[PDB]
Design a protein around this nucleic acid. Structure first.
Lengths: 89, 198
RNA sequence: AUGGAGAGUUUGAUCCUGGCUCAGGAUGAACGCUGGCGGCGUGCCUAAUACAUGCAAGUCGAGCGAACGGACGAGAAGCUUGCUUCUCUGAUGUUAGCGGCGGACGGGUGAGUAACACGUGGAUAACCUACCUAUAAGACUGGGAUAACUUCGGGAAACCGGAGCUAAUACCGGAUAAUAUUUUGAACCGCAUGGUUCAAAAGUGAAAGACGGUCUUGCUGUCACUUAUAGAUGGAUCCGCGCUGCAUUAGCUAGUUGGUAAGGUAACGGCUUACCAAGGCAACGAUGCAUAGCCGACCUGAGAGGGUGAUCGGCCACACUGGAACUGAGACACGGUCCAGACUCCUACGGGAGGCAGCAGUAGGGAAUCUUCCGCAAUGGGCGAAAGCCUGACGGAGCAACGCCGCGUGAGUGAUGAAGGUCUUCGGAUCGUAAAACUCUGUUAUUAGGGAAGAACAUAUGUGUAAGUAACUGUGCACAUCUUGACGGUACCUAAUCAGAAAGCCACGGCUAACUACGUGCCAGCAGCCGCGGUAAUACGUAGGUGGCAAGCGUUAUCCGGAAUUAUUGGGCGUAAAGCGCGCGUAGGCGGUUUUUUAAGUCUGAUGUGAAAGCCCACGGCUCAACCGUGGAGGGUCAUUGGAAACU
């Protein structure tokens, strides 16, 4: 259900993952909180964050949750820990 | 070309053009199966599908592969009298083994398909892919020297139009896509597709 | 809008109509000689056959009576001189379990599934939300029990039997700080039904452990605990369409036809009841029969646009059948009770249950499903700080012309004859400067290892920063200790390697282009429109070449080219595919209109604006490929805004 989904994709070893955190009751293939971007976060380049950065107000304030790697890359983006600064604001 | 080489087989090849031929002491008609006889490419049970060999193996690929190349002809869907023909006739079987490119065009695909060709770039081991601009179809810089590699200063340079070369290991250019300037005209833009279309 | 012969398309033949093997493609594909390699994509159709189960769903003493052992101190040595045989700590660990958990989903199937079952679009006055985010209370609590712990016999057995008994983050005896609670006057909306206005009386606990450096609590941070709010989230009720199709299925139905009062759904009802009309339903083929998980999916007719589920994706239903109840917030539960049922096994008879739709293979089969396959490596998520497992999710290992792909088959020069013979009242041309031997040479080809990238991601280290709690800190982590394959001492490379280590078809039949011949005399039999064959077979059988293309060769089921030979677009009906003994008739279809108003439709304005193998380009990798994906165009495609001729 609910952690940052590093979602399987592609042809034979083309794991073009997608930024997602699946629903609290849906599977990896099912419906979701919301699909936020089209990139493989395990890309050989980097985490390579391209998301709906403006959506940090909705899913973080309701439901969403990272897991141990992208909470870092989100707040060097100014999202995840920075939403704690927003909550303090 | 025609599944033949004019050093030994200029006969079933309507055009092979590698050597002296065999009209001198031999009869130049054919050894088999690709002379001018009743092969069905016409009013469709006629007498030109031996020249379907002049159509098919001219650009190398065999049928169901040349069939791939003709839908590639239909891909450039501009003027299908010319925009189909230009890229249907835009490959290289003239960089390949025997006569002048360095000495690499004729007995075609023996040696230049090294697998270590080391083009300008990473690697493109197969000239079936129409070469790109800047991506020079070179040979292995570490095993470079051959009678087919650095002989372009003496035998013949200049593969077709907008597709040039160098001398140091024979680095291609392919600066622009090849038009019909130095590209062939043996594949009819009208009849050869009327075998397919109408 | 870009498509399009029919080898032919009847009679004696000239001609019309007609439908038509076939030859081309793809198909879950599959059937009849394995090749240079590799690569793709994929996956019990028959076998939704029984299923054996393994294993199939597991996470937390970081909750505690902690029991157990047992860390550590560990009297006395128990003396072939080294114990916790002792004090209390008794930590951490199954903890004895009591408890927080999920478990329908990662997993499976389409059995069933007539109607939102889903596709697919609406209105909702039809709202609730263990796990969850945020604003408001602290971390007051009964511990009876309760396995802790003890006690009582039986039967191989199944599994029970009597007697008592501690903790918890269990929960609960008694008061509490968050739209809490629904009344007095307080509004109108979608009449019904909402709108909170009022004043909150009414919410009321607790989960404190492990506890950081210390203030051992600040907020007990953690990750577990009580109270309004919304919301993620999902589901949620009311309308149209496919919500079924079908009379050699027609007349359908009876608190019926679904408001009022009682009851109840977060919502709302004949859902049952005191009343309502026989009404209501109708060849809108209701009734009933058949059927059903639904969409894309593909192929494709010129465009029109469509048939398309195997897979493959999405969206329903079921998980030994069934039936009652329990339940987890929701369960009838892929791996929950009682069960009938059914069989299975056991039986030592006293009775007990089992329980393949996870995923492999087991009997089986098939043309088809691999392999009772690999491991969690990575990613994934449920519970869990930390950490863990499920992995049969995931990814991979094999499988393969099901369908291919690049390389595949590299050099012709000197005697035309250095040598080569289907068909002779042979001429030297001759499958042939081919050929021996190699002009040109060292790729694939095998190759032998330096080997190497990929191999980075994820923490792993306090130096210390941020949250920093009264402050350094446990986690994120600048350090940076350098990890990482379900794959690679192989790739890249030396070139090692040499003219090396890699090509068949019907026929040699008019159309089948593959040559004429012989045993061949309508015989054998090749045999596709049609044949041939009868002492002159080209053809049966055979042949050196030999033909159309090559990993090549011909077929098998599906659609369409073929052939709009399937018709608004793109059929006619005398004969031909078809025009009624007949006429007479209601609804109707259409019957002649002449004027005039609306903007409802008659290439929406312009944009947020668009499903894949499928609306334009850019891409990267693809030995080319095999095949994969990516961004813009997001469209120029719906919604949203428009009002107005010369029809209505």
């Amino acid at each position: 259900a609910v952690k940052i989904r590093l979602t399987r994709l592609g042809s034979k070893r083309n794991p073009f993952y997608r930024i997602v955190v699946a629903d609290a009751r849906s599977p990896r293939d099912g419906r979701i909180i919301e699909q936020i971007g089209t990139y493989n976060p395990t890309s050989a380049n980097a985490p390579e964050i391209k998301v709906d950065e403006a959506l940090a107000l909705k899913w973080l304030n309701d439901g969403a949750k990272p897991t141990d790697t992208v909470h870092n890359i989100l707040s060097k983006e100014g999202i995840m820990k920075k939403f704690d600064e927003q909550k303090k604001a | 070309r025609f599944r033949g080489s004019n050093w030994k087989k200029s006969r079933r090849l309507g055009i092979s053009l590698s050597g002296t031929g065999k009209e001198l002491e031999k009869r130049p008609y054919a050894p088999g199966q690709h002379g001018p006889n009743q092969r069905k490419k016409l009013s469709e049970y006629g007498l030109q599908l031996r020249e379907k060999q002049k159509l098919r193996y001219l650009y190398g690929m065999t049928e169901r592969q040349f069939r791939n190349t003709f839908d590639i002809a239909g891909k450039k869907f501009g003027v299908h009298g010319e925009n189909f023909m230009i890229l249907l006739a835009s490959r290289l079987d003239a960089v390949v083994y025997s006569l002048g490119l360095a000495r690499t065009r004729r007995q075609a695909r023996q040696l230049v398909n090294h697998g270590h060709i080391l083009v300008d770039g990473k690697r493109v081991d197969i000239p079936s892919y129409s070469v790109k601009p800047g991506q020079t179809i070179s040979v292995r810089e570490k095993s470079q020297k051959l009678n087919i590699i650095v002989e372009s200063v003496e035998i013949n340079n200049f593969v077709p139009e907008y597709l040039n070369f160098d001398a140091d290991s024979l680095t291609g250019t392919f600066v622009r896509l090849p038009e019909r300037s130095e590209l062939p005209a043996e594949i009819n833009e009208q009849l050869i597709v009327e075998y397919y279309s109408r």
